[PDB]
Ligand binder design. Structure first.
Ligand SMILES: O=C([O-])C(=O)[O-]
Ligand SMILES: O=C([O-])C(=O)[O-]
Ligand SMILES: [Mn+2]
Ligand SMILES: [Mn+2]
Lengths: 115, 115
């Protein structure tokens, strides 16, 4: 199958994981589609000023691929500035967050893979 | 960890899986780092006229997320026009290919998840 991102209605989430402002999440493939091996495959849009709040992953890991804009990725107690083209990897047992510190939308892909 | 795409030296590959022309692949995360749950997380670049040739996947599935450009994704005997923002899903037992039928570069993420 092909899924045209452009044509998936995002869910608007306020204070996602305790973050700032409103964020949009477009689910691109279901976990069932992904044979229960990954539980999330989504495109996130963070308006200027918004963030996904600090939260922990256990028994899984998450990858962000930054698609557009700029911001700051927090992982293992460190802030790292990120931009389009960056991969952010969060391992099992770590906590992370991400904030849009620029003036255009920060978009990225998020994939959570089990165990 | 953060991995900055632009700073990875791609591997140049001619006639990838029997395709046309020469493509570039940047491996972004190793299988090890992904706990042996995925065997590939790469950013591919196809110049116009180039393709990843037809090939079969077994015991795993693969996702392309299109980054830039346009082209044609072949799956289950059908040619499907794709463009930036599209997700291409190839399930286990299926065969796929992708060709840059456009006039600029076609870039995409490829992830192969096991079982
Ligand atoms: O949903 C999550 O875990 C995320 O987006 O980081
Ligand atoms: O090598 C593969 O499986 C691919 O890139 O589609
Ligand atoms: Mn997370
Ligand atoms: Mn393939």
């Amino acid at each position: 199958m092909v899924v045209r991102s452009s044509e998936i209605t995002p869910e608007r989430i306020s204070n996602m994981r305790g973050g700032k402002g409103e964020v949009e999440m477009a689910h691109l493939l279901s976990k069932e589609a992904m044979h229960n091996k990954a539980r999330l495959f989504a495109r996130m849009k963070l308006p200027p000023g918004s963030s996904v709040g600090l939260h922990k992953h256990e028994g899984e890991f998450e990858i962000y691929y930054i698609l557009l804009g700029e911001g700051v990725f927090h992982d293992n107690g460190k802030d790292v500035p990120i931009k389009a083209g960056d991969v952010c990897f969060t391992d099992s047992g770590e906590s992370h967050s991400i904030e849009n510190t620029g003036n255009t939308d920060l978009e990225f892909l998020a994939v959570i893979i089990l165990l």
